[PDB]
């Protein structure tokens, strides 16, 4: 009798866990745990964990855009996040989060692909961030999202030059350089249930016994990237503008703990 | 120790040895069986155009009137006598699947296996829950047929306490068209063992005890004067089928007699393998006649 | 899911209408199905629907590195899709057999036979070289596929059109549509299938059969051939004995049922050129 | 370089009316129920075939009617000068599966070993011309060899056509030239096909030509074949007693 | 499979120094070598050992080296465990005992002292000889593994890669010239391409060449990698079961004494071979 | 040890099984049609005298010549051996006094039309048409053994042909 | 290309291949040394069973999926995934692989079968899930003992536990047995060897090995060596299950 | 209290005895699982030894039990079930059970109907007697009129009440649906 058995903690304004209906859990970072990687970023968010390890490689680019470095993402839900899951390929919500990532990393604009260009038509870096998700408790997409910009402020790369002799280029694994980053897009999740009761942050079950999800990219200076509204009972505007303020709120939360992260280093 | 490597050398076909040259009527399909009034065709053949048409490769038998073929090579077709030895395969609510040398999974209903002793009253649900524990899945059974049915399949029973489960013995899998068709498959040897030879290609070959049906295992050794006959009795058969001769008492116990003086390993080298083998076929033929 | 069950009255009645020489609709034997032919507004796209069965086939083109066997002439990538719509059977990853004979067959029908010039679309005899590939897809399934995808192929790989590019030394210049007019392909004779189907282990044979035949048949005989009368293909499927004659005159039937065909595709082309130059998108012909 | 000579010859030294000597032999692999070897030239096809016996994992497909044919193909990395990969599961060996497998179920009378698997096998060591057929017929020994009815030997070769004539089973050389090759597989004692094969452009009035020539070698086959089983069926029978 | 009692009778043999066979715990069985099976390849073999038969090809190919090593070749193996050995093979069934040997395989020869490949190098980082080993499963008879490896020793032996000159010139034209002498083609030391060695333990004792009605009686088994020198190449453990640390020395000693023997005799039988010719026929499969 | 005759003539017990598997391997049903074999088999399970002894027509006789030829061969192949047995009597030991009653009942007829031809009693016609039904089950389980099927579909039809009313009713104490 | 994954570069190079510079190497140190080691159990909490291993630059996760339902033929099974992270070592490799993993796989399922006593689990399959995070040194053997771990916190039953211990050999002019070493000392080294155990009973489990060279006597002394390490390391992970226990009976 | 380790051993066969998670080897008992131990003592004096793992330490319906559960797939022979409560202690462990057709309703009639007694989708409550043997199915039955079902959902959203032994109505609207009512 779940449904049931939650609807009543929904109307004493609460949760059977403690939250309030409009805040979310206990969210930690961890940057620079990993040395193999070039950037890493562990996130979790009480029982939800997160990791990203941004590799940074050489490739040649395509004949539209020379000047582009790719940044590749890809989710891992290995079956060690939760029994959902089997060994073997992709499923779908591994693959659906992919495209979520790339969207966003292609929307944002938090990174210029032209400042991945070493030698334009001959070489160009490929940021490869994979991310891997080891507990699904819910709420997976922000968790990933917010991963993914820790590393990448993470990463510093070296510096390369090329050799006009040689016709090759030589790198310089001492002598480096951060990546710089103009948005630093936050994702706000919300779980819709029968007409108007929006939750925040739903863990597992919540989001099995849900009649919709949502979720929301907010930019710093009060812009969207993304508007994830896979299906639902509907919404009007009146419940929107709500979410995005608290979206707004999140980003401003989510920024504070990044910059106080990246300065205790 | 001892390894040892050497190439292959080139058959010598025809099998000259002997010179024989048959009496019979060898055939392969397509080939035409004598097309007159009225004559019934049997296993190995079938009807085209009014015209008699083989379908296997082997020899042709006419009985009185009725046109069969024999092959050289099949598998176990089930008739209603015949012993039987068997690997079970599986455990089925009502029965077990068993595995012959058959184009089919054998079949032992759960009414067919003997109890032990003569406790006999009836099968209830303990009897089917120890179908399990007293048979297991992998084990050797002894049995004669029951019957065939007309989707292919045998099902097999137990008439006595001599057939049911195997002791530890040892085992081989030969063509079933290299046994005699002849009776008493159960041989007990004077060299010290006994022998089961299935009308399939699934021979067993147990050490003979003294006091003279399978429901207590005698996981007890085996004294080596009585392991070393074992052994050389599988290497012999297997040196008769790699030699296509039958297979009965007359054929082991002298091809045995002869492997004697070659010790118990030196006898599956191709050379010593076909000097036994001729030796036991020109005494079995001399004698004999 | 799974197809529904054939009727053994079904089974039946078509065996003795087929003993009496009578088809369903109401056509003899030696006769298709009316084959339409339309276009889309992109060149190098074709729905051709005979009856029932409409199969789309879509023309794309592509530059790439060349194989270092042939450096001189280009590549070719055919591929046929089975869409759950056309029938509910047609599962992704199940009913490979289908997909593995259709595929070879028409991969086999237009690129051994030399149907195009992969040649002429040589750009960097070394470096870089076309590819053009050729998607097929199935929509409604009703008897007669090969058939189908094979005047979709060629009615798109005739209806097709290049974006032009200019060559100096090793400086190659792409352009688009809007800046030059895209050149056609290079064809230089258009084979079309034609399948026979045999009943009663060779006694009856049919042309274009529907669905039930094709499960109430144990053979089918596809044979390619051009407005010239050269065997392109021929395939047996089915496991059935046929004999000579037979093959004869199901050849001697697949040259005037290619002509026929032929001459109709050449129809629609000149009716969609006709349109774009009075403006309008479409090109439509009819058997 | 050339593929017929003025005079009539072929490069290997053969007219076009002829073929290489098939050696063969049945019983290679005795921990099977059926087993054979064939050498067609420099080709080199081995087939098995295990048993009518149960099947496994019934996944509802016993036919209860008939038997249940199962034929797989494999031509090994090395066969080829050029090294390939994948061997299974690529496009074109499934097709040979089919192929061997709406034969086999025409020949093999399957009407008496019903929800039963005949698994055929058959792996190409050495490939120069001709490699569906010396696995056609690899396969006919084999199923020979198991004792399995069938209606008769399925006979399978290739032949081609070359400056106006017809060439009997093709080699790598004329089947790498692109000229048209029509393989085939028919049961000799109707003078039925049961598969025809054709892969390239050529007229219609040159096909009855190139039709009774792979025929004919067809044919030829079937008498280097029967005389091979023969000789295995008199050998083994002397054997027994 | 088996069943119980026929075990107790195994292990009880094994025990008392007798097998079905009636042979020790220290003896191989004839296995019939043959090489030079293929044409079509640059070397190739065949073993039988007892009802195992393996066919092995080797082709030399020419690649692009690999960029940590420019400066020689390298060695790949592929293995076609076609179901003709049990039917239970097919196109998925088989790549887990075709990837295990294959890597088995890499593992024997990541030793930079087997084959030495600066010897398959003609212009580094330019070009270099590739040699594609393919193995062929046909049965599965038991001691899989040490027939596998006689088979890649013997078709190594029986290789011939062809002398190539590859010339440079200006303006990115290459040329490769060849030696239009099949009899002047080079040949690759083996004195150091190990034999694999498989000692299954059963009951209290370990034994070598399990057939597999014995296989199935064990519990362990220690692969084993020897040269004819003693050295010990690889050394891994394959089985559902445990192993005690003082019977792994035991296993180690007869391997060592085992691929002494066998190398020994390989070498004798091959040379032999060599010396007769085309005088042999090349009876194979026939 | 056995031969296929044998597991062919164990299938049968209702009558003389050597002469019926003779008769098979001799080729006579193989021929006939679904009555006449149901006659040749009255042949044997009936063994009652009637006064007058029957007049035959060719088709439903001819086929008794050859059951005679082979019941002859039978009693040579029994004198060699000496098994005290008489020719004349093992061969009249089987009356046809009722191919023609069987025939006419499995023609579909009423058993008025068939308690008339013979001047014999209505219990041994049931009697012997039981045991011939008897004897059709086993003559098809044979037939079902060598291998063939028209011979079993055709004792079948037979069987089918014979229980119509009243020769197979039921007992009232059961 | 593959079609359930993001479009990216047909190939793509690492950099250090077109370094200029000769690596450091280690060195000098106690050939008989063991790194510091954090082991905890209990870290996941959606599954039934789960475990963390840290050994220098080595962290490693395993989760075991409980019994699922899929005498000696209704005996259990376990199957084992192991699965490097992409972004572990000095180059990338796609998430499939199917080269190594598949080996270690094996290696991880024949050294833990024996210790599982899977009769007390028929007609059920463990799902074993091993994560390598971060690659360091000796990999396989962390592997085993975070998957012992992880069924031991599980609750599935056992004989006793799996401890692993990875060995290289010196390649100086006096080659000596280095225990427990490092990514480096393992790139630049002649022969690698990897033991493990259970040390109650003191059986091995699952062994493995390769060398550039060796001989007899050399792989007996690093087996030995490499018993003496598994033994020396039994405790902390003793200590870790103890800690998890006491944490759940905290929790009710 | 003290919590132990898949290999230590415990004590000898002499003073103790495996009772369960544990296993024996020469001359000692060693342990099987990681959890807490505890030596039972009957008035035997010989203690019975065991190791227990309490996050889901260990439940057992018996024969005269009451168990609720959940009907998910129903037939006109039998209806299959998910056990939740037994009793009414939860247990994650969701074992399946099974509800015969006769073995519905204490009058034992054959007149009785699945569809009219149960749908899939409720909630009932029922007596185990079968515990089962290859899949562990327990078979449940409802022969009392104080059994059955308790809660049920309407032809949609809408939960009914109880109104009679073989009825049932949904409070907003009016429709009378057939179940075999409980109490």
Redesign the interface.
């Known amino acids: 009798e779940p449904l049931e058995y939650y609807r009543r903690f929904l109307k004493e304004n609460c949760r059977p866990d403690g939250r309030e209906l409009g805040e979310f859990r206990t969210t930690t970072v961890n940057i620079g745990?990993?040395?193999?990687?070039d950037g890493?970023a562990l996130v979790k968010l009480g029982?939800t964990?997160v990791?990203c390890?941004?590799?940074?490689?050489?490739?040649?680019p395509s004949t539209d855009a020379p000047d582009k470095g790719?940044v590749?993402?890809?989710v891992?839900l290995?079956?060690?996040?939760?029994?959902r899951f089997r060994?073997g390929?992709?499923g779908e919500e591994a693959?659906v989060a992919?495209?979520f990532i790339?969207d966003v990393i292609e929307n944002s604009q938090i990174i210029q692909k032209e400042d991945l260009c070493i030698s334009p038509g001959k070489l160009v870096w490929?940021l490869?961030c994979?991310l891997?998700c080891?507990?699904?408790?819910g709420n997976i997409l922000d968790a990933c999202t917010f991963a993914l910009l820790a590393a990448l402020k993470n990463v510093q790369l070296?510096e390369?030059t090329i050799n006009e002799e040689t016709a090759?280029?030589?790198?310089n694994?001492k002598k480096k350089s951060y990546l710089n980053i103009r948005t630093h897009p936050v994702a706000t999740s919300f779980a819709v249930f029968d007409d108007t009761l929006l939750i925040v942050d739903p863990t597992?079950e919540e989001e099995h016994l849900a009649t919709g999800t949502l979720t929301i990219v907010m930019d710093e200076e009060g812009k969207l990237c993304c508007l994830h509204k896979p299906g639902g009972s509907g919404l009007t505007g009146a419940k929107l503008q709500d979410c995005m303020s608290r979206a707004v709120t999140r980003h401003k939360e989510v920024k504070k703990l990044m910059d106080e992260v990246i300065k205790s280093m | 120790m001892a390894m040892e490597m050497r190439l292959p050398v080139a058959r010598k076909p025809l099998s000259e040895r002997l010179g024989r040259d048959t009496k019979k009527h060898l055939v392969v399909p397509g080939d035409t069986i004598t097309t007159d009034t009225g004559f019934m065709r049997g296993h190995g053949t079938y009807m085209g155009e009014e015209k008699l048409i083989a379908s296997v490769a082997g020899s042709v038998e006419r009985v009185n009137k009725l046109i069969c073929v024999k092959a050289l090579k099949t598998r176990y077709i089930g008739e209603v006598g015949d012993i039987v030895v068997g690997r079970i395969t599986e455990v089925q609510q009502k029965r077990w699947k068993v595995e012959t040398n058959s184009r089919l999974d054998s079949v032992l209903l759960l009414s067919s296996m003997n109890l032990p002793g003569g406790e006999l009253r009836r099968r209830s649900a303990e009897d089917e829950l120890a179908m399990?524990g007293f048979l297991?899945?992998?084990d050797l059974i002894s049995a004669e047929v029951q019957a065939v049915f007309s989707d292919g399949a045998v099902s097999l029973h137990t008439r006595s306490l001599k057939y049911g489960k195997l002791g530890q013995g040892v085992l081989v899998q030969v063509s079933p068209s290299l046994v005699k068709r002849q009776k008493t498959h159960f041989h007990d040897l004077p060299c010290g063992a006994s022998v089961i030879l299935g009308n399939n290609g699934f021979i067993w070959i147990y050490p003979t005890p003294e006091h003279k049906g399978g429901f207590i295992a005698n996981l007890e050794p085996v004294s080596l004067a009585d392991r070393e006959v074992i052994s050389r009795l599988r290497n012999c058969i297997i040196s008769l089928v790699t030699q296509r001769m039958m297979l009965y008492d007359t054929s082991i116990l002298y091809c045995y007699e002869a492997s004697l003086p070659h010790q118990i390993k030196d006898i599956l080298k191709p050379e010593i393998m076909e000097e036994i083998v001729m030796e036991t076929r020109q005494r079995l033929l001399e004698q004999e006649g | 899911m799974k197809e529904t069950p054939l009727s053994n009255c079904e089974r039946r009645f078509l065996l003795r209408a087929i003993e009496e020489k009578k088809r369903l609709d109401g056509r003899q034997t030696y006769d298709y199905r009316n084959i339409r032919i339309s276009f889309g507004t992109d060149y190098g796209c074709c729905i051709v629907e005979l009856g029932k069965t409409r199969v789309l086939g879509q023309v794309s083109c592509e530059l790439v590195s060349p194989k270092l066997n042939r450096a001189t002439e280009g590549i070719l990538f055919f591929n046929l899709e089975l869409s759950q719509m056309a029938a509910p059977a047609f599962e992704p990853g199940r009913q490979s057999d289908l997909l593995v004979k259709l595929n070879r067959l028409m991969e086999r029908c237009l690129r051994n036979s030399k149907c195009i010039d992969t040649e002429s679309l040589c750009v960097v005899a070394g470096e870089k070289v076309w590819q053009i590939r050729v998607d097929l897809h199935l929509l409604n399934h009703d008897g007669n596929i090969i058939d189908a995808a094979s005047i979709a192929a060629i009615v798109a790989l005739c209806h097709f059109r290049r974006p032009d590019v200019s060559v100096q030394g090793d400086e190659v210049t792409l352009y688009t549509p809007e800046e030059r007019d895209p050149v056609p392909l290079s064809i230089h004779h258009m084979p079309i299938c034609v399948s026979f189907a045999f009943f009663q282990q060779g006694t009856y044979l049919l042309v274009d059969p529907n669905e039930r035949e094709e499960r109430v048949m144990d053979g089918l005989l596809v044979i390619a051939m051009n407005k010239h009368r050269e065997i392109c293909t021929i395939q047996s499927s089915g496991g059935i004995m046929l004999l000579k004659d037979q093959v004869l005159r199901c050849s001697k039937i697949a040259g005037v049922k290619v002509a026929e065909i032929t001459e109709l595709i050449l129809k629609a082309l000149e009716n969609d050129q006709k349109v774009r130059k009075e403006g309008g998108k479409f090109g439509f012909a009819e058997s | 370089l050339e593929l017929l000579s003025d005079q009539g010859y072929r490069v290997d030294g053969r007219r076009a009316g002829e073929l290489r000597k098939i050696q063969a032999r049945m019983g290679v692999f005795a921990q099977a129920d059926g087993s054979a070897y064939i050498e067609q030239g420099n080709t080199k096809a081995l087939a098995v075939v295990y048993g009518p016996h149960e099947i496994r994992g019934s996944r509802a497909r016993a036919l209860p009617d008939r038997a249940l044919v199962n034929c797989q193909y494999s031509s090994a990395t090395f066969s080829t000068g050029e090294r390939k990969r994948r061997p299974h599961g690529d496009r074109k060996s499934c097709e040979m599966g089919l192929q061997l497998r709406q034969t086999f179920e025409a020949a093999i009378l399957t009407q008496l070993h019903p929800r039963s698997q005949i698994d055929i096998y058959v792996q190409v060591l050495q490939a120069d011309g001709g490699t569906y057929a010396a696995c056609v017929n690899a396969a006919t020994l084999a199923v020979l060899d198991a004792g399995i009815p069938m209606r008769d030997f399925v006979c399978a070769c290739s032949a081609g056509f070359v400056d106006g004539t017809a060439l009997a089973d093709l080699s790598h050389v004329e089947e790498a030239a692109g000229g048209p090759q029509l393989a085939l597989a028919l049961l000799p004692a109707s003078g039925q096909i049961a598969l025809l094969e054709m892969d390239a452009r050529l007229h219609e009035d040159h096909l009855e030509r190139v039709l009774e020539a792979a025929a004919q070698a067809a044919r030829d086959v079937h008498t280097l074949l029967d005389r091979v089983v023969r000789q295995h069926v008199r050998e083994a029978s002397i054997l027994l007693g | 499979t088996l069943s119980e009692a026929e075990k107790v009778y195994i292990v009880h043999g094994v025990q008392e120094d007798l097998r079905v066979d009636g042979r020790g715990c220290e003896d191989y069985r004839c296995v019939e070598v043959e090489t030079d099976v293929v044409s079509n390849t640059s070397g190739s073999a065949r073993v039988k050992l007892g009802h195992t038969d393996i066919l092995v090809g080797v082709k030399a190919e020419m690649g692009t080296p690999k960029?940590?090593k420019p400066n020689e070749g390298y060695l790949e193996f592929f293995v076609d465990c076609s179901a003709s050995a049990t039917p239970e093979f097919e196109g998925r069934g088989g790549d887990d005992l075709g990837?295990?040997i294959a890597?088995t395989l890499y593992?024997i020869f990541?030793?930079?002292?087997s084959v030495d490949l600066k010897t398959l190098c003609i212009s580094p980082r330019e070009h270099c000889w590739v040699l594609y080993v393919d193995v062929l499963l046909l049965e599965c008879g038991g001691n899989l593994f040490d027939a596998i490896s006689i088979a890649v020793k013997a078709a190594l032996f029986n290789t011939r890669i062809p002398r190539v000159r590859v010339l440079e010139d200006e303006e990115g034209s290459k040329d490769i010239e060849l030696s239009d002498d099949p009899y002047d083609c080079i040949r690759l030391s083996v004195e150091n391409v190990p034999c694999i060695v498989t000692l299954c333990k059963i009951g209290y004792r370990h034994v070598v060449d399990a057939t597999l009605q014995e296989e199935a009686c064990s519990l362990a088994s220690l692969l084993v990698s020897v040269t004819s020198k003693?050295?010990?190449?690889?050394?891994?453990?394959?089985?559902?079961?445990?192993?005690?640390?003082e019977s792994?020395?035991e296993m180690?000693?007869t391997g060592?004494r085992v691929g002494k023997v066998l190398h020994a005799s390989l070498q004798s039988v091959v040379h032999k071979e060599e010396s007769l010719g085309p005088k042999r026929q090349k009876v194979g499969f026939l | 040890v056995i031969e296929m005759k044998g597991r062919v003539a164990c299938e049968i017990s209702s009558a003389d099984e050597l002469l019926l598997t003779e008769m098979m391997f001799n080729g006579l049903f193989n021929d006939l049609s679904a009555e006449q074999a149901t006659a040749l088999l009255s042949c044997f399970v009936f063994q009652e005298n009637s006064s007058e002894m029957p007049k035959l027509t060719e088709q439903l006789a001819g086929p008794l010549r050859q059951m005679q030829e082979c019941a002859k061969r039978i009693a040579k192949v029994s004198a060699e051996a000496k098994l005290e047995i008489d020719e004349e009597t093992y061969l009249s030991s089987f009356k046809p006094h009722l191919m023609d009653v069987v025939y006419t009942w499995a023609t579909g007829a009423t058993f008025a039309h068939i308690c008339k031809m013979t001047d014999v009693f209505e219990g041994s016609i049931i009697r012997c048409m039981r045991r011939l039904e008897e004897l059709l089950r086993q003559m098809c389980q044979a037939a079902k053994a060598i291998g063939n099927t028209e011979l079993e579909n055709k004792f079948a039809e037979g069987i089918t042909k014979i229980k119509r009313d009243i020769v197979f009713a039921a007992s009232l104490y059961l | 290309g593959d079609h359930?994954?993001?479009?990216?570069?047909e190939?793509?190079?690492?950099?250090?291949?077109?370094?200029?510079?000769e690596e450091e190497a280690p060195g000098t140190r106690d050939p008989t040394r063991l790194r510091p080691v954090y082991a905890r159990?209990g870290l996941?909490?959606?599954?039934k069973g789960?475990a963390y291993l840290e050994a220098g630059?080595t962290?490693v996760?395993?989760?075991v999926?409980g019994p699922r339902q899929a005498?000696?033929?209704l005996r259990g099974r376990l199957?084992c995934?192991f699965?490097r992270?992409?972004?572990?070592?000095?180059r990338?490799r796609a998430?499939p692989g199917?080269?190594?993993e598949?080996?270690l796989a094996?290696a991880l399922q024949?050294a833990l079968?024996?210790?599982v006593?899977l009769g007390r689990y028929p007609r059920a399959q463990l799902?074993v899930?091993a994560?390598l995070?971060?690659?360091?040194g000796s990999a396989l053997a962390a592997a085993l003992t975070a998957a012992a771990l992880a069924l031991?916190?599980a609750?599935?039953?056992?004989?006793?536990?799996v401890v692993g211990c990875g060995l290289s050999l010196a390649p100086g002019p006096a080659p000596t047995w280095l225990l427990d070493p490092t990514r480096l000392e393992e790139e630049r080294a002649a022969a690698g060897?990897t033991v493990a155990?259970?040390?109650?009973?003191?059986?091995?489990?699952?062994?493995?090995?390769?060398?550039?060279?060796?001989?007899?006597e050399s792989?007996?002394e690093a087996?030995?060596l490499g018993?003496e390490g598994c033994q020396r390391l039994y405790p902390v992970l003793?200590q870790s299950?103890?800690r998890?226990?006491?944490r759940?009976?905290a929790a009710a | 209290v003290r919590?132990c380790?898949?290999?230590?051993?415990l004590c000898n066969l002499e003073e103790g005895s495996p009772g369960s998670?544990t296993?024996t080897?020469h001359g000692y008992i060693?342990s099987?699982?990681?959890?807490?131990l505890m030596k039972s003592s009957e008035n035997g004096a010989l203690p019975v030894v065991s190791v227990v793992?309490?996050?889901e330490s260990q439940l057992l319906p018996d024969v005269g039990a009451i168990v609720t559960c959940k009907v998910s797939s129903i037939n006109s022979r039998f209806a299959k079930v998910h056990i939740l409560y037994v009793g009414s202690m939860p247990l994650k462990n969701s074992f399946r059970g099974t509800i015969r057709k006769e073995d519905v309703r204490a009058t034992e009639k054959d007149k009785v109907e699945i569809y009219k007694s149960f749908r899939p989708g409720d909630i009932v409550l029922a007596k185990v007697i079968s515990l089962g043997d290859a899949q562990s199915n327990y078979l449940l039955t409802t022969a009392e009129n104080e059994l059955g079902v308790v809660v049920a959902h309407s032809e949609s959203g809408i939960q009914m009440v109880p109104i009679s032994w073989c009825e049932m109505q949904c409070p907003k609207t009016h429709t009378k649906e057939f179940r075999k009512v409980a109490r």
């Open positions: 745990s990993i040395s193999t990687a890493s029982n964990t990791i390890g941004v590799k940074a490689e050489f490739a040649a790719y590749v993402p890809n891992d290995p079956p060690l996040c939760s029994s060994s390929p992709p693959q992919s495209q790339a490929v490869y994979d891997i080891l507990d699904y408790d070296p390369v090759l280029a030589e790198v694994l597992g | 399990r297991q899945e992998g | 960029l940590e990837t295990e890597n593992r990541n030793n930079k002292s003693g050295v010990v190449t690889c050394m891994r453990k394959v089985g559902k079961g445990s192993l005690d640390p792994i020395f180690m000693e060592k | 359930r994954r993001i479009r990216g570069p190939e793509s190079q690492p950099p250090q291949l077109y370094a200029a510079d159990a996941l909490s959606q599954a789960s630059g962290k996760l395993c989760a999926s005498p000696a033929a199957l995934d699965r992270a992409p972004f572990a070592g000095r990338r998430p199917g080269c190594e598949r080996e094996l024949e079968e024996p210790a006593r799902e899930s994560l995070l971060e690659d360091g031991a916190d609750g599935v039953e056992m004989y006793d536990l060897l155990l259970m040390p109650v009973l003191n059986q091995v489990a699952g062994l493995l090995g390769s060398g550039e060279g060796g001989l007899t792989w007996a087996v030995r018993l003793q299950l103890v998890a226990a006491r759940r009976g | 919590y380790i898949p290999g230590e051993r998670g296993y080897r060693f099987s699982l990681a959890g807490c793992r309490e996050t």
